[PDB]
Design a protein around this ligand. Structure first.
Ligand SMILES: CNC(=O)Nc1ccc(N(Cc2ccsc2)C(=O)Cn2nnc3ccccc32)cc1
Ligand SMILES: CNC(=O)Nc1ccc(N(Cc2ccsc2)C(=O)Cn2nnc3ccccc32)cc1
Lengths: 304, 304
C-alpha cells in the first residue's frame, strides 16, 4: 500500500545523455544508435533568440562546430540536419548503451518521466503530465534544454518529449523527438499564449480509485450522477468533459473496487462543489490529476 | 523555474538489483562488490512470521538454498551471514556494475530516493523523507522488500535504507544497510506502535524559500517572530521545534532571497494559524515537508 508520484527508473535514459556545444551554447543531447538529437536553438546567440532564422544560422555551421561529448569521450560528427525544431547530429559511433526505443507523440493528459540533465549529466527524475494545453509544469533551469521525457514498457523506452523552453509565465514547452512542438509554441524568445488549461478529469477519477484501494475512503458518498450532470459540474470547475472512452479506460479500477464510474463521478462532484473541508486524500489537499488510469493500475500491481 | 519532488537518477542503483529466493519466498537483494544484501525475512514461511526465530531458521539454510539471480544469470553463493535484520550473501563474482558507494544511517527529517523493485527488477523511483518517527510513507507492495533508499553525491551512492515491512497502519519500516531498523520496529508480523510523528519544520521553511525563488510569494507578510514565539505555534500544530542549527542550515536560502529566517517563520506561523484560504504554493494545498534545505539549493542550482 501507499501511493506515490512515481517516475520510471531512469537508467536506460541516463545511458543516452550527452553534452552538445555549438559556439557559446551548451545543452543536452540524446544519443541513440549513431544519431544525437538536440534542440536546434543550440545554434543561437543573444542577438538571435528574439526571432532566429534557423536555416541561416545552421548554414554557418559545419559538422566540426558541434561538440558532442559522452562523459569524457568526444564523439565525431559526420553529418547534421534539422528536422522541425531538432538537430540530428550523425556520429561515427553507435551508442553501445542504446536501449530498445521508440519515438512517440503523447496525447494531452498522458504522463511521463523527465530526466533533468545539465551538461549531459543527469540531475534528477520526476513524473509529470502533458497538460491539456500542451505545456508541462516541470523543474528546468538554463542548460536543461535537450532533457527528455519518456515512458518505459518492459525493455522499451518510448521517448515522447525533448525540453526546449520556459515561457515567460514559468511553464515549460518542448517537442516530440521529430522536433514538432506540443502546442502552439515556437522556439523564439517571445511572449506566447499557452491557452486555457483544464484539469484532467479521467486522471482525478483514477487517483480517487487509487485512494480507495489504498484505504482513503472518506470522500465516498451515497450518491450517483450521469455523464451529462457530471459534465455540467466539470464545465463550472474547468475540468475536461468526461466521455464514455474515459469511463471505459476506468473499467479496470471500477472492477477492482466495485465502485461504478458514475458513483465515483458523484464523489468527485461533491468534492468539487464542497472542497476537502481541511481533509486530505493520499497526502494531498487538492484533486490530483497527474496519474492516468494506466499509472494507477501499474503502481497498484507492481509492474516492472 | 518550477519545483518538483525530484528523485536521484536511479541508473547506478538499477545496476545493483538482484532477485533473492529462499524456499518459497522471493524478494530483492542489493549486489555490491561480491556481497548481496537482503532482508533476513526471506528465510521465513507462513508459520514463522508471527515471531520468527531467525537464528534457528537460518541454521536450516545452506549457501545453495539462497537463489540469487542478476537478470538472467545465476550468482553462485559461497557464504551467508546475518547482521542484525539483513542477510549478507557472499557470491563468487563481484558486481561489474558496482558504483562508488557508502552505507549511511540517515537522520529523521532527511530525504532520499527509493527504487521500488519486484523480482529484482526496478518498477519506479520516488523521493521521500524519513519521518521524525522513523517510518516512511512509501509505495510498496508484497515482493518490494529489499528495495533500497539512497542519495547520490557526484559519483557516490550513499545507501541509507532497505525496505522490510509494512505496518498494519499502511506505513513503511526498514533498516540501514547494516540491518539496523530505523525506529523501534522489529521484523515480525505484529501490531507495532510507530509513535507520534511531527512535521519537519526546517523542510517546510526550505520549501517556502523554494516557493519565493520560483515566484509563489502571496504568503509573505509584514511580520516577524522569534524562535520562542514560533516554537509555541510549532508546539500547537505538531511541528518540530526550530533550533539555531535549523536556522543556520537555512542560511543559503535566506541569503539568496534576502528574507530573514525569522521573517519566513512569521509567514509559516500565519499559514499555520490561518490555513491557505483555498490558495496553493508550488502546486500544493498543504505545507510540504519532504524537501530539505540541501534539496532546495540543489534543485534550484541544478547540481548533477
Ligand atoms: C547564449 N545563448 C543562450 O543562452 N541561449 C538560450 C537562452 C535561452 C533560451 N530559452 C529561450 C529561447 C530562445 C530561443 S528558443 C528558446 C529558453 O527558454 C531556455 N530555457 N529552457 N528552460 C529554461 C529554464 C530556465 C531558464 C531558461 C530556460 C534558449 C537558448
Ligand atoms: C510466504 N512468505 C511470505 O510471504 N513472507 C512475508 C510476508 C509478509 C511480510 N511482511 C510482514 C513481516 C513478517 C515478518 S517480517 C515482516 C511485510 O510487511 C512485507 N511487506 N513489506 N512491504 C509490504 C507491502 C505490502 C504487503 C506486504 C509488505 C514479510 C515476509
Amino acid at each position: 500500500s501507499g501511493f506515490r508520484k512515481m517516475a520510471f527508473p531512469s537508467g536506460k535514459v541516463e545511458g543516452c545523455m550527452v553534452q552538445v556545444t555549438c559556439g557559446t551554447t551548451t545543452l543536452n543531447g540524446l544519443w541513440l544508435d549513431d544519431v544525437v538529437y538536440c534542440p536546434r536553438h543550440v545554434i543561437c546567440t543573444s542577438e538571435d533568440m528574439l526571432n532566429p532564422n534557423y536555416e541561416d544560422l545552421l548554414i554557418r555551421k559545419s559538422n566540426h562546430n558541434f561538440l558532442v561529448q559522452a562523459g569524457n569521450v568526444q564523439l565525431r560528427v559526420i553529418g547534421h540536419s534539422m528536422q522541425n525544431c531538432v538537430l540530428k547530429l550523425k556520429v561515427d559511433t553507435a551508442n553501445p548503451k542504446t536501449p530498445k526505443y521508440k519515438f512517440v507523440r503523447i496525447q494531452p493528459g498522458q504522463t511521463f518521466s523527465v530526466l533533468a540533465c545539465y551538461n549531459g549529466s543527469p540531475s534528477g527524475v520526476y513524473q509529470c503530465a502533458m497538460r491539456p494545453n500542451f505545456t508541462i509544469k516541470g523543474s528546468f533551469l538554463n542548460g536543461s534544454c535537450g532533457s527528455v521525457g519518456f515512458n518505459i514498457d518492459y525493455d522499451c523506452v518510448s521517448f515522447c518529449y525533448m525540453h526546449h523552453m520556459e515561457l515567460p509565465t514559468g511553464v515549460h514547452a518542448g517537442t516530440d523527438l521529430e522536433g514538432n512542438f506540443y502546442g502552439p509554441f515556437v522556439d523564439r524568445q517571445t511572449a506566447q499564449a499557452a491557452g486555457t488549461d483544464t484539469t484532467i478529469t479521467v486522471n482525478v477519477l483514477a487517483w480517487l480509485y487509487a485512494a480507495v484501494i489504498n484505504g482513503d475512503r472518506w470522500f465516498l458518498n451515497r450518491f450517483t450522477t450521469t455523464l451529462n450532470d457530471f459534465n455540467l459540474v466539470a464545465m463550472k470547475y474547468n475540468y475536461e468533459p468526461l466521455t464514455q472512452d474515459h469511463v471505459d479506460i476506468l473499467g479496470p479500477l471500477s472492477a477492482q473496487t466495485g465502485i461504478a464510474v458514475l458513483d465515483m463521478c458523484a464523489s468527485l462532484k461533491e468534492l468539487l462543489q464542497n472542497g476537502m473541508n481541511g481533509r486530505t486524500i493520499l497526502g494531498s489537499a487538492l484533486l490530483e490529476d497527474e496519474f492516468t488510469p494506466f499509472d494507477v493500475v501499474r503502481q497498484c500491481s507492481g509492474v516492472t
